[PDB]
Amino acid sequence: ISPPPCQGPIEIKETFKYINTVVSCLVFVLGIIGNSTLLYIIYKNKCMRNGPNILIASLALGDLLHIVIAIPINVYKLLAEDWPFGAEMCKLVPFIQKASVGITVLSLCALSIDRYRAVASWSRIKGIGVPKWTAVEIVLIWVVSVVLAVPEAIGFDIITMDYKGSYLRICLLHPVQKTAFMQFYATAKDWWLFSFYFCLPLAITAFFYTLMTCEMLRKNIFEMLRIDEGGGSGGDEAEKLFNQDVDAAVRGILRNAKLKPVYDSLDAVRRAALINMVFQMGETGVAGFTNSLRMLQQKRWDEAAVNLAKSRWYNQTPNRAKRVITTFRTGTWDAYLNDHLKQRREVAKTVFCLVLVFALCWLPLHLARILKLTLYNQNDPNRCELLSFLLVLDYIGINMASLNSCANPIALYLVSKRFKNAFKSALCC
Numbered sequence: 001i002s003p004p005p006c007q008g009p010i011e012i013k014e015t016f017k018y019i020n021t022v023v024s025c026l027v028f029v030l031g032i033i034g035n036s037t038l039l040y041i042i043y044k045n046k047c048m049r050n051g052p053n054i055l056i057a058s059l060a061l062g063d064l065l066h067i068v069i070a071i072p073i074n075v076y077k078l079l080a081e082d083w084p085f086g087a088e089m090c091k092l093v094p095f096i097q098k099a100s101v102g103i104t105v106l107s108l109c110a111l112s113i114d115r116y117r118a119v120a121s122w123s124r125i126k127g128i129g130v131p132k133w134t135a136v137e138i139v140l141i142w143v144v145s146v147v148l149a150v151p152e153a154i155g156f157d158i159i160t161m162d163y164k165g166s167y168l169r170i171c172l173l174h175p176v177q178k179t180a181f182m183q184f185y186a187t188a189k190d191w192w193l194f195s196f197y198f199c200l201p202l203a204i205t206a207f208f209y210t211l212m213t214c215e216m217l218r219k220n221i222f223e224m225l226r227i228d229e230g231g232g233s234g235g236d237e238a239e240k241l242f243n244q245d246v247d248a249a250v251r252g253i254l255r256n257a258k259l260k261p262v263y264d265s266l267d268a269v270r271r272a273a274l275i276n277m278v279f280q281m282g283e284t285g286v287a288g289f290t291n292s293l294r295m296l297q298q299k300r301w302d303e304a305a306v307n308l309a310k311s312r313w314y315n316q317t318p319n320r321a322k323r324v325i326t327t328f329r330t331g332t333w334d335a336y337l338n339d340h341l342k343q344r345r346e347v348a349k350t351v352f353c354l355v356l357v358f359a360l361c362w363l364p365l366h367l368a369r370i371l372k373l374t375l376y377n378q379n380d381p382n383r384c385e386l387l388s389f390l391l392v393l394d395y396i397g398i399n400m401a402s403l404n405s406c407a408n409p410i411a412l413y414l415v416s417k418r419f420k421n422a423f424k425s426a427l428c429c
């Protein structure tokens with residue numbers, strides 16, 4: 001017997017009973033089709049199976065089992081407005097949900113780490129089949145996620161609510177827990193979800209994504225100079241010596257009064273083109289392009305490109321000048337685009353896409369919960385208008401978190417052309 005409070009939330013709960021039902025059906029249809037297709041695509045392709053993309057298959061299977069189990073039960077619960085499944089199902093569904101969120105966050109972390117290790121080596125030789133250590137990684141990811149979900153199976157049980165005469169059974173984390181550790185988990189449930197299942201995955205993925213993109217940049221500027229110098233060879237020793245020459249060059253840029261303001265203005269890609277000109281003719285020579293450097297600082301790419309075209313540097317070496325100038329105008333690596341640079345652009349866009357989708361889907365829920373414990377008080381007479389506002393955001397946050405179970409296959413379709421052809425070929429079959 002636990003009666004509810006006032007008026008405001010009742011009309012909103014009824015309004016969202018239809019919204020949540022629509023979102024649940026969309027996530028179910030889009031999720032069971034996208035994740036099943038993605039699982040088939042990853043494993044059947046031998047060139048993705050022997051790499052870090054097998055972790056995306058683990059991510060897809062984790063969402064897939066969450067879709068088929070949690071979504072239909074939650075739809076039945078919303079429509080019936082009562083829990084009619086018994087005690088066993090009241091413990092299974094939260095356990096399945098908690099394990100799925102753990103599989104998602106641990107597969108995302110392992111993918112960003114493996115993608116960093118993949119770009120940290122020259123001439124890496126892939127094996128045949130799933131790597132043995134990646135298999136241990138996936139097993140451990142699922143083992144840890146199940147163990148961390150055991151409290152949900154222990155704590156959840158059915159209670160009876162008294163709504164001014166009407167009795168309705170509710171499945172929730174029981175306020176009275178049997179053991180001291182289990183009662184502590186009831187108080188720190190939301191903080192534990194925010195710390196381990198949001199702050200930890202974001203901190204690790206963004207850290208290794210930064211390391212991966214920095215390493216991609218030092219290799220792109222490496223191949224950029226070797227292409228412009230006619231050719232060369234890669235390797236850790238060759239890159240280490242080349243990075244020292246680049247670091248010594250930028251130290252001369254930052255001491256030069258003419259090149260310091262324009263270099264700080266440019267982005268990482270356009271800074272590589274300025275470094276290229278320094279490698280070719282020295283800093284005293286690059287500082288002579290006073291008009292062009294001013295236009296680059298004012299971010300007039302077309303005007304600076306035209307002004308650089310009418311120069312002795314352009315006439316003597318047209319081919320190299322056109323590529324360096326194109327890099328200034330576009331700000332991309334299109335003039336030096338090869339199989340290596342195109343591979344790194346594909347990797348960087350997919351990893352950044354999955355992490356961003358995960359962060360945007362779970363940000364409203366946690367943001368709505370911090371507003372509940374920093375702005376709400378039971379005493380205040382004006383709580384029902386404020387409670388009315390807080391419940392809307394929490395419902396929005398619950399729906400946004402459910403969309404993450406179907407957003408990953410769609411996200412890869414729009415960002416990656418490699419997966420887009422794989423999705424079309426799979427559904428054309």
Ligand SMILES: CCCCCCCC/C=C\CCCCCCCC(=O)OC[C@H](O)CO
Binds near residue numbers: 109137
């Ligand atoms: C009782 C309190 C327990 C609190 C929780 C502690 C145990 C789970 C944490 C890390 C296990 C990660 C290893 C499992 C396999 C995943 C490999 C991986 O990629 O880990 C990502 C990141 O390093 C992970 O911190």
